[PDB]
C-alpha cells in the first residue's frame, strides 16, 4: 500500500491541498472583487445616464453616533468570532505569528507568518500578505473577506510589514533582511525595505496591476543610520502615506538630557535608566526611535520614504505605532515595550514633525515579564511587554477602546475594554480566565451608523496548543 | 568563554548576613545584559533568587526572599556579591551564580525565553551556629 | 507564582529505555520552559530550551516536546552517561521557578 498512498492519494491530496488553499479562495475573492468592480461600474453608468437634463462599511467620520458613556459592571459587549472566514486556522502543527491588521474606509489588509512546530524556533511556512473588503454578513454584523492575496517568494526575509490603505489600492512596507530580525541582528541588517503595492478589488488578468513591488531606491533617513517600517497600519494625507516606523541611531549620536527622567515618585530607579532603555540591551550600538514614513506618491516614478521621528515628550523604545485616522484626525498609538507600562496613545497635533498630545491614562496598562509589570511607572531599563492597541472611538468624551490583557506579569486574559483616561467604562472578557495570549490589533469602523471594532487577538488554544490570530467584531453598544 | 566562580563563607551563623561572590572570568559584566543567582537546598529542589543587570544596578528579587536578598555590584573587579539578611537553617543551601540568557524570538514581541547557560561550580552555604 | 510539578520524583530504568519526564505547571506557559540536566557535585547544564529545541553540544537522545502545562523530556536510549537530576525551569514570567527535580537511576 506505498505505491497507492504514493500516487494515487498522495500526489492528488497535494492537488486539493493547492486548489482549495490557493486557486478557490483567490478566485472568490476575485469573484468578490468583480461583484464590488461591476457595482461601482454600473453606479458610475447610473450617474451618468440617468442624471438627466432639462428641455456599507466606513471609518469612523464626523456624525454624532451615541454610545454607552456610563460605567456599568453588566456585560453590555458581545463579542462576535467573525474570524473562520480567513486563513486563520491551519492544522495543529503551525504556530501563526507576526500578524497584521489595517482597515482604511472599508479595505482591510491582513498577513501572517505561518511557521512549523514551536511558535519561536520553527520554520517559517510561508507568509501570506492580502488585503480584502470589510463586509456585512445577514445578522447585521461585520466579517472580513480577502480578495486579493499575495506571499513573498523568500518568507525568511520579509520582516516587519506595515500596510496603508490608498485610494482603491493597498500599499504595504516591509523589511527585507536576510540576517534575521533586524531589531534583534541590527548591526549587521542590510539596510532595505520593499513595498509591494496590494489592488484591494482585483482584476482577472491584473498581472503589473494587482502586486507590482516596488523598489525604494531612496530613504530619507537623517541622523538614523538605518530605518525600518514597525507597527500594524497608517493613515494617507491624500497622496501621502505615513507607515509607523521605528530608525535605528548609533548610541553615541543619541543625546539625552537625565534629569528629564522622571525619577520623582520613585527611588529604585537611576535618572540613568531612561536613556538606556531606549536600545532593547542597554550596551547596544542602535537605538530604537519610533516614528513615521512620510510616502508621498507625487514624487514620480521613483518616490523616496522619508523618516519623521517622534517628539521627545513621553519618549521611550520604538514599539509599533499605529497611527490611524479617527474622527477626522489621526491618532498615534504607540507600545509600551518600556518603563513606561502605562497605555501611551494621543491624538496627533502635527504628522510631519511627529508631535502626539499623549493621554495622561492611568488605568490601561500592559502585562511585562520580567522587570516592568502592568501599571509600573519607574524608569527601569527593559525590553519587556506586548502590544495592544486603541482605537479611539469617541473624541467628544475622549473614549478610545481595544482589547487588553488583565494580568501584571502573565500575557493572558485579553479583555475588550472600552475606557476613558481615568476610568474603565466597561468590558468584555473574551475568554477563559487563563487565555495566554499577545499581540492585540483593535480597528474599529462605521457598519450603518454603529461602531463596530475588529480585534485580532492572538489567542493561545489549549486544544491544539498553538497560537491562532482570532478576531472579535465587538460592537460598542448605545443602550448601558 | 565565561567561567564563573564562586567564593564565600560556608560558615554563616544565624540571623547574620551572608557574603558571597562570583567573580567573573572570561567575560565582563558590561556585557550580559542579566545576572542571576539560585540557591538549591540539599533534599529539595532548585529555587531561584534574582538578578542583576550588570550594566545597571536595577534588581529583581524572589518575592518569597523578597525583603532579605541584596545583591551589589563591582564593575571594576568584575564581580556581582550576594547578601542574604536574617539566615535562618532552612538557607542551607548551594548559592550557584548563573549567567543569565534571553531568547528574542521576532522583536516585535519583548518577552524572551529565559533559561541559564553559563553555571558557576556552586558552593555549598550551611547556616550553622 | 508559577509551581512547577514534575511527575515522577524519582523515576528508575536501565541503560537503553525510554524516559519520559513531566514537569506540569499551574498557570499556562506557552512555551517558555528549559530543561536543566544537573550531575551530583556538578552544576546544572542546559539540555531543552524552548521545550523543544536540542541544544549544541546535547546528543540526539534527548527530546522534548509539549507545550501549555504539560511538558515531556524523552530520552530515547538511556545511556550510563545520563543518571542525574532532571529539572525544569520556566521562563514566561519571573520568579522563574524550577522544579522540584527529577532522579534518574539504573534499574540493576
Known amino acids: 500500500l506505498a505505491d497507492k498512498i504514493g500516487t494515487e492519494i498522495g500526489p492528488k491530496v497535494s492537488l486539493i491541498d493547492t486548489s482549495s488553499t490557493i486557486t478557490i479562495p483567490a478566485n472568490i475573492g476575485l469573484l468578490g472583487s468583480k461583484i464590488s468592480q461591476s457595482t461601482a461600474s454600473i453606479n458610475e453608468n447610473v450617474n451618468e445616464k440617468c442624471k438627466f437634463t432639462l428641455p456599507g462599511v466606513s471609518n469612523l467620520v464626523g456624525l454624532p453616533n451615541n454610545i454607552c458613556l456610563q460605567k456599568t459592571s453588566n456585560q453590555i459587549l458581545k463579542p462576535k468570532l467573525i474570524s473562520y472566514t480567513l486563513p486563520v486556522v491551519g492544522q495543529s502543527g503551525t504556530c501563526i505569528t507576526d500578524p497584521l491588521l489595517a482597515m482604511d474606509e472599508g479595505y482591510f489588509a491582513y498577513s501572517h507568518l505561518e511557521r512549523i512546530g514551536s511558535c519561536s524556533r520553527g520554520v517559517s511556512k510561508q507568509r501570506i500578505i492580502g488585503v480584502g473588503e470589510v463586509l456585512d454578513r445577514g445578522d447585521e454584523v461585520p466579517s472580513l473577506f480577502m480578495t486579493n492575496v499575495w506571499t513573498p517568494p523568500n518568507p525568511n526575509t520579509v520582516y516587519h510589514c506595515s500596510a496603508v490603505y490608498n485610494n482603491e489600492f493597498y500599499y504595504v512596507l516591509c523589511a527585507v533582511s536576510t540576517v534575521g530580525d533586524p531589531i534583534l541582528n541590527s548591526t549587521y541588517w542590510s539596510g532595505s525595505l520593499m513595498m509591494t503595492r496590494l489592488a484591494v478589488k482585483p482584476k482577472s488578468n491584473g498581472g503589473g496591476y494587482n502586486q507590482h513591488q516596488l523598489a525604494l531606491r531612496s530613504i530619507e533617513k537623517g541622523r538614523y543610520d538605518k530605518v525600518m517600517p514597525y507597527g500594524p497600519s497608517g493613515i494617507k494625507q491624500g497622496d501621502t502615506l505615513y507607515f509607523p516606523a521605528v530608525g535605528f541611531l548609533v548610541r553615541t549620536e543619541f543625546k539625552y538630557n537625565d534629569s528629564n527622567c522622571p525619577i520623582t515618585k520613585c527611588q529604585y530607579s537611576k535618572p540613568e535608566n531612561c536613556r538606556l532603555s531606549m536600545g532593547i540591551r542597554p550596551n547596544s550600538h542602535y537605538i530604537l526611535r519610533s516614528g513615521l514614513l512620510k510616502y508621498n506618491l507625487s514624487d514620480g516614478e521613483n518616490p523616496k520614504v522619508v523618516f519623521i521621528e517622534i517628539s521627545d515628550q513621553r519618549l521611550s523604545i520604538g514599539s509599533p505605532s499605529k497611527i490611524y485616522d479617527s474622527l477626522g484626525q489621526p491618532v498615534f498609538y504607540q507600545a509600551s515595550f518600556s518603563w513606561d507600562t502605562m497605555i501611551k496613545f494621543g491624538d496627533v497635533l502635527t504628522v510631519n514633525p511627529l508631535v502626539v498630545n499623549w493621554r495622561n491614562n492611568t488605568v490601561i496598562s500592559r502585562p511585562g515579564q520580567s522587570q516592568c509589570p502592568r501599571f509600573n511607572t519607574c524608569p527601569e531599563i527593559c525590553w519587556e511587554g506586548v502590544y495592544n492597541d486603541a482605537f479611539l472611538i469617541d473624541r467628544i468624551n475622549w473614549i478610545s477602546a481595544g482589547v487588553f490583557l488583565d494580568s501584571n506579569q502573565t500575557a493572558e486574559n485579553p479583555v475588550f475594554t472600552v475606557f476613558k483616561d481615568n476610568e474603565i467604562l466597561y468590558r468584555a472578557q473574551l475568554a477563559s480566565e487563563d487565555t495566554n495570549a499577545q499581540k492585540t490589533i483593535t480597528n474599529c469602523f462605521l457598519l450603518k451608523n454603529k461602531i463596530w471594532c475588529i480585534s485580532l487577538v492572538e489567542i493561545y488554544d489549549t486544544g491544539d496548543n498553538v497560537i491562532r490570530p482570532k478576531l472579535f467584531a465587538v460592537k460598542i453598544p448605545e443602550q448601558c | 568563554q565565561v567561567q564563573l566562580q564562586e567564593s564565600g563563607p560556608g560558615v554563616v551563623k544565624p540571623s547574620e548576613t551572608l557574603s558571597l561572590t562570583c567573580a567573573v572570568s572570561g567575560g565582563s559584566i558590561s556585557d550580559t545584559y542579566r545576572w542571576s543567582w539560585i540557591r538549591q537546598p540539599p533534599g529539595k529542589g532548585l529555587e531561584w533568587i534574582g538578578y542583576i543587570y550588570g550594566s545597571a544596578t536595577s534588581t529583581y528579587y524572589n518575592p518569597s526572599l523578597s525583603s532579605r536578598v541584596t545583591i551589589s555590584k563591582d564593575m571594576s573587579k568584575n564581580q556581582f556579591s550576594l547578601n542574604l539578611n536574617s539566615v535562618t537553617a532552612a538557607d542551607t543551601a548551594v548559592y550557584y551564580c548563573?549567567?543569565?540568557?534571553?531568547?528574542?524570538?521576532?522583536?516585535?514581541?519583548?518577552?524572551?525565553?529565559?533559561?541559564?547557560?553559563?553555571w558557576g561550580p556552586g558552593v555549598l552555604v550551611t547556616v550553622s551556629s | 507564582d508559577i509551581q512547577m510539578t514534575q511527575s515522577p520524583s524519582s523515576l528508575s530504568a536501565s541503560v537503553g529505555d525510554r524516559v519520559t519526564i513531566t514537569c506540569r505547571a499551574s498557570?499556562?506557559?506557552?512555551?517558555?520552559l528549559s530543561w536543566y540536566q544537573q550531575k551530583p557535585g556538578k552544576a546544572p547544564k542546559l539540555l531543552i530550551s524552548?521545550?523543544?529545541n536540542l541544544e549544541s553540544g546535547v546528543p540526539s537522545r534527548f527530546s522534548g516536546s509539549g507545550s501549555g502545562t504539560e511538558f515531556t523530556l524523552t530520552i530515547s536510549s538511556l545511556q550510563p552517561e545520563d543518571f542525574a537530576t532532571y529539572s525544569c525551569?520556566?521562563?514566561?514570567?519571573?520568579?522563574?521557578?524550577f522544579g522540584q527535580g527529577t532522579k534518574v537511576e539504573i534499574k540493576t
Open positions: 525551569l520556566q521562563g514566561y514570567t519571573t520568579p522563574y521557578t
Open positions: 524552548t521545550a523543544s
Open positions: 548563573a549567567r543569565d540568557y534571553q531568547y528574542y524570538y521576532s522583536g516585535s514581541y519583548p518577552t524572551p525565553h529565559n533559561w541559564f547557560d553559563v
Open positions: 498557570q499556562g506557559i506557552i512555551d517558555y
